[PDB]
Amino acid sequence: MELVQVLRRGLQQVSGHGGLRGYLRVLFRANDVRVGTLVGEDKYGNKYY
Amino acid sequence: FFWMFEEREKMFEFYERVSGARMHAAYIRPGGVHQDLPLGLLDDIYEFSKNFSFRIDELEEMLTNNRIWRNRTVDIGVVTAEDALNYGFSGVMLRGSGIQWDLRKTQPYDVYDQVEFDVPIGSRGDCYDRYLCRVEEMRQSLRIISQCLNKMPPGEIKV
Amino acid sequence: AGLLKKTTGLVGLAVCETPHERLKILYTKILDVLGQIPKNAAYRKYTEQITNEKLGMVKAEPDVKKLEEQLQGGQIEEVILQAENELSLARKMLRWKPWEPLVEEPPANQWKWPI
Amino acid sequence: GVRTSPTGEKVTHTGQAYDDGDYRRVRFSDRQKEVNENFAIDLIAEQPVSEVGSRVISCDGGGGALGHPRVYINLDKETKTGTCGYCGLQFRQPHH
Amino acid sequence: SKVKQDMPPPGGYGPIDYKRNLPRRGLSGYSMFAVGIGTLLFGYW
Amino acid sequence: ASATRVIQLLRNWASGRDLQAKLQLRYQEISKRTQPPPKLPVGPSHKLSNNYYCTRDGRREAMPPSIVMSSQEKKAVTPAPPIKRWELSKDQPYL
Amino acid sequence: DTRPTIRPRNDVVHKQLSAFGQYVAEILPKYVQQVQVSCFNELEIFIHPDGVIPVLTFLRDHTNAQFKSLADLTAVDVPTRQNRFEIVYNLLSLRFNSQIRVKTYTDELTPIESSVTVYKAANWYEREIWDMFGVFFANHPDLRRILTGYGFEGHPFRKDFPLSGYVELRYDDEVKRVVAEPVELAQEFRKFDLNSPWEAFPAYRQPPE
Amino acid sequence: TYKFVNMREPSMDMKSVTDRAAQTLLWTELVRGLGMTLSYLFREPATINYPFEKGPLSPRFRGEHALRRYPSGEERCIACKLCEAVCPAQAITIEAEPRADGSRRTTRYDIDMTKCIYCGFCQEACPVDAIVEGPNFEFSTETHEELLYNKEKLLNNGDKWEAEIAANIQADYLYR
Amino acid sequence: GTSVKPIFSRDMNEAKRRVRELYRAWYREVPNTVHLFQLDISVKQGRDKVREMFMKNAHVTDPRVVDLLVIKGKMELEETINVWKQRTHIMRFFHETEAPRPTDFLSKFYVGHDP
Numbered sequence A: 001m002e003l004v005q006v007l008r009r010g011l012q013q014v015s016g017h018g019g020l021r022g023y024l025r026v027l028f029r030a031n032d033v034r035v036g037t038l039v040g041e042d043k044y045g046n047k048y049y
Numbered sequence B: 001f002f003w004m005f006e007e008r009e010k011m012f013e014f015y016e017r018v019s020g021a022r023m024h025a026a027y028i029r030p031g032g033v034h035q036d037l038p039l040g041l042l043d044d045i046y047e048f049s050k051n052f053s054f055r056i057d058e059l060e061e062m063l064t065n066n067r068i069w070r071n072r073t074v075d076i077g078v079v080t081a082e083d084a085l086n087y088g089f090s091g092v093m094l095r096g097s098g099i100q101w102d103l104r105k106t107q108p109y110d111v112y113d114q115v116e117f118d119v120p121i122g123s124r125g126d127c128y129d130r131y132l133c134r135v136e137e138m139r140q141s142l143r144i145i146s147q148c149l150n151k152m153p154p155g156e157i158k159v
Numbered sequence C: 001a002g003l004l005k006k007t008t009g010l011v012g013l014a015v016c017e018t019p020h021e022r023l024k025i026l027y028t029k030i031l032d033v034l035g036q037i038p039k040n041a042a043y044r045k046y047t048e049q050i051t052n053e054k055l056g057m058v059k060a061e062p063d064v065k066k067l068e069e070q071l072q073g074g075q076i077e078e079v080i081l082q083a084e085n086e087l088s089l090a091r092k093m094l095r096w097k098p099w100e101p102l103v104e105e106p107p108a109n110q111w112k113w114p115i
Numbered sequence D: 001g002v003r004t005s006p007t008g009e010k011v012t013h014t015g016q017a018y019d020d021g022d023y024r025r026v027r028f029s030d031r032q033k034e035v036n037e038n039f040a041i042d043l044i045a046e047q048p049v050s051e052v053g054s055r056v057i058s059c060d061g062g063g064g065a066l067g068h069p070r071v072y073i074n075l076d077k078e079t080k081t082g083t084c085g086y087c088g089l090q091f092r093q094p095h096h
Numbered sequence E: 001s002k003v004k005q006d007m008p009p010p011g012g013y014g015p016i017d018y019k020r021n022l023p024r025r026g027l028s029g030y031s032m033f034a035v036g037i038g039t040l041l042f043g044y045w
Numbered sequence F: 001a002s003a004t005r006v007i008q009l010l011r012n013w014a015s016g017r018d019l020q021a022k023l024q025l026r027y028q029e030i031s032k033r034t035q036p037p038p039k040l041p042v043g044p045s046h047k048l049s050n051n052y053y054c055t056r057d058g059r060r061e062a063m064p065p066s067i068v069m070s071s072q073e074k075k076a077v078t079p080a081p082p083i084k085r086w087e088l089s090k091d092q093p094y095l
Numbered sequence G: 001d002t003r004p005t006i007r008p009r010n011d012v013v014h015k016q017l018s019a020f021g022q023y024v025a026e027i028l029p030k031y032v033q034q035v036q037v038s039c040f041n042e043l044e045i046f047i048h049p050d051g052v053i054p055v056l057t058f059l060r061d062h063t064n065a066q067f068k069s070l071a072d073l074t075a076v077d078v079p080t081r082q083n084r085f086e087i088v089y090n091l092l093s094l095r096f097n098s099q100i101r102v103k104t105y106t107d108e109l110t111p112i113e114s115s116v117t118v119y120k121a122a123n124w125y126e127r128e129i130w131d132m133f134g135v136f137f138a139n140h141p142d143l144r145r146i147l148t149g150y151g152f153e154g155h156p157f158r159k160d161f162p163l164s165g166y167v168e169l170r171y172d173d174e175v176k177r178v179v180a181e182p183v184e185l186a187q188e189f190r191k192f193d194l195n196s197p198w199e200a201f202p203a204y205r206q207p208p209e
Numbered sequence H: 001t002y003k004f005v006n007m008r009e010p011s012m013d014m015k016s017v018t019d020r021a022a023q024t025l026l027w028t029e030l031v032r033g034l035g036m037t038l039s040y041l042f043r044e045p046a047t048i049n050y051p052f053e054k055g056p057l058s059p060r061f062r063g064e065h066a067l068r069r070y071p072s073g074e075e076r077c078i079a080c081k082l083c084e085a086v087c088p089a090q091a092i093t094i095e096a097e098p099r100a101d102g103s104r105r106t107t108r109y110d111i112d113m114t115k116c117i118y119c120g121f122c123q124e125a126c127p128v129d130a131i132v133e134g135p136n137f138e139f140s141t142e143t144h145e146e147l148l149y150n151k152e153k154l155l156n157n158g159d160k161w162e163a164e165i166a167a168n169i170q171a172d173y174l175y176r
Numbered sequence I: 001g002t003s004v005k006p007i008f009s010r011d012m013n014e015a016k017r018r019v020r021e022l023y024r025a026w027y028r029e030v031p032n033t034v035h036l037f038q039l040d041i042s043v044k045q046g047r048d049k050v051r052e053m054f055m056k057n058a059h060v061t062d063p064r065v066v067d068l069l070v071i072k073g074k075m076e077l078e079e080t081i082n083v084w085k086q087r088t089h090i091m092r093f094f095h096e097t098e099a100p101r102p103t104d105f106l107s108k109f110y111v112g113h114d115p
């Protein structure tokens, strides 16, 4: 059942990244698929995960 | 190449954490090492040493018993044991041929004498024997690493 | 010798199945060559001493394994190899003739090494 | 303080400023003459004059081992303010 | 405060394996030849 | 940069070993990177008494090379006593 | 112990090496000039040049000497002495593990006989000396230049040779090739004046005159 | 002590010869490596997403040189020229002077980064911790002149990477 | 003092002989090194460079020095013949990129401080 579990997690990350638009933006710009906790934000506009 | 080069990068991390540069340390100076190790370095060395043998043998299985690694390498370019030492050959080049000689044991500099270890001594003097000697030297290096890791004394770093 | 040892361990030389007579003949030859060498030379004294000692022990003890032990020269093959080298050395410097005094002194201060 | 040259260049804390002709100014066209604004000459002057009341005063520059080597300046001359050569803080007797 | 630095734990360290633990796997040569020949024979049938 | 048990059993069988005991990865087991300030120890000659450098200098206690023979019945002597033979490996004499 | 910083002193090796030094001095009085053993248990033998082949052979062949390993071969240029160049042979024993050093002297022109036969490792080392100090070696099998660039000049390790050399090379489009030009540094090597004018070691003081 | 590496000669019974013939004919060690590499294929790929993720470093990391300054803002360099006498590549050049205030600061302090070999000798030589090497390594430039730093550039480096250098020194001065 | 050891040649005559076939080899070499290395040098202006280099060390009179120049030219000959040398090193003798250097004192004074 870990296969359907990882399928569910893969469909969960598309929700974690602010929906389809945010997910596609992250995939195309940052070459990343995973979502981490926002540990901080600098003045210039970079999110630290 | 790449499988062991990840571990080599892990070595470079230790090099960076002790001296300050991952490759060119400038660490070991006359009168002892430059400065003490950072806290927690020994534990990370311990974990790496635990994990290393399981990939050393992994490299072995790919190369040691392979047909074409041996065939390209076994018994090509023999070097005679007598003709080896006159030619000024040294290190594994000697040990590959068969002379039982190693400065770490016969002329022990620093604390190499208190460290117990066997050396790999070659059989046929060929390319393959030297390669096997290098790998067995890996493993004896791991054993030496364990020994020095367990028994580092309290003291200063420079004279 | 029982089962003759397969390999000495050094690939540069093989096993001599009859080593005792080899020790004997090479030692006798180099003793002859030293007999050539004039008496006053210290080389003849030292080398005749060590070689007659070696010949005595090799002709005394006929077990090869103990022969290496009291010969402190490893396997008998590298021992007869070194004996051949000693023969060669004595023969080669027979006509080099080093027993003569020094050819000449070094020029003035040629060895002091604070500059 | 940083001031502009007659040509327009920003003078440095050392006083460097390329003159009128000074052919070696093409290096700065389409670029900038990098000058640091935090002048060390004046950033030490506005610091208050410490009023510690003893004849001879120790100074390490703050931070203990992170500061400069410990120097003992003499708060003896009544007509001026003693200062550590390394850091530059002006030490003075509290008007005796 | 007592002097402290990077030191091994008081119980030393765990053993570090260095022996070649290259695994052994595979049927007997007779078994391999037998299974190959049996697959062949089924194919020809 | 852990995995599925279906893949976990596939890689182990293909690799013929239990690699989960230690991966080439390195997880939280690493040493912390905010270690407390270490109080470094001192050397032997740190006392304030009987530390006279005269009885401790190493460079000053070096004599010139001892001259043996110059251009201006003893038996035969070897440079070193003959080196002994090493022992076979008790653990793995032959690989 | 009482001396935790000073290196340990091994007098047994010192006496034993001195005994072997007297041995080798007695065996070959023709070429040997002066044998001495350093404080740190390292023996050096100063021989006449004509003994490059004989002495080495005696050290390579003799049963009681047994040195077959050419650790390195080096020249040490010193312009002060009459024969400026001095050549050092470093030998290591196997049966009687130890390090011996034999030292000879030659000037720029007086050739020194090439070992090669005594130690076939010397060959490349040999070439280096010729390509690095100007010390030509008699009947060396191939004494071609070994290290420096093609068509080079001089012998750089000579102490008179400047640090920066004489000529660099760089691209030239006018001729479409790398060309060699006389030296013109962008910043000159600052030669610091170290070696404080106060005597360091009273033991090694030069006698007056 | 020593171990012989390859003396394990094979036996010659029917079972052993059959096994060796099978291994030679029915390629087995070939398949062994072919399956090991498969195990490495299904594993977790070791790869760090640069520049989004950077490699681990240490507080001792030697990088871009920079000239720090005291908390008061005054530059720590008293131009003792120890760092110039120490740099093995002679990449450091200082000219000193009695300043208007008096404190002997550098009229010129330039480090030739193309001559520098990034050893950290200058910082350990500095008696006031003026010169240091910041954690920055991201200064790959386009022109050779861009690399040749100046006193003002070093001051700007010390004023940009400053919280970094202060934090690293606070975490490392006890070791050194 | 005055007595010294030779390299090969005994007297000026035999070293004079060695430079003879050194020039022999250089003559027979120049055309086919021009051909092989694709030189921009011409045959005549190849030979005259050899002649001028041979004339450059005209002042030498010590024998041993002459053996040294002849063996160094021998090494040069090997470097050229079997293509170990490269075209740029061959051009190195011809000073193309090197600007002409004045000779008269007046031009030296005009240029800068130099004897």
Ligand code: SF4
Pocket (backbone or CB within 6 Å): H065, H083, H086, H087, H088, H089, H090, H091, H092, H111, H115, H116, H117, H118, H119, H120, H121, H122, H123
């Ligand atoms: S690291 Fe600093 S002190 Fe060392 S050579 Fe480079 S610039 Fe000079």
Ligand code: SF4
Pocket (backbone or CB within 6 Å): H076, H077, H078, H079, H080, H081, H082, H083, H084, H094, H122, H125, H126, H127, H128, H129, H130, H131
């Ligand atoms: S060592 Fe430090 S104080 Fe001295 S000149 Fe260099 S940077 Fe300035």
Ligand SMILES: [Zn+2]
Pocket (backbone or CB within 6 Å): D059, D060, D061, D068, D084, D085, D086, D087, D088, D089
């Ligand atoms: Zn101060």
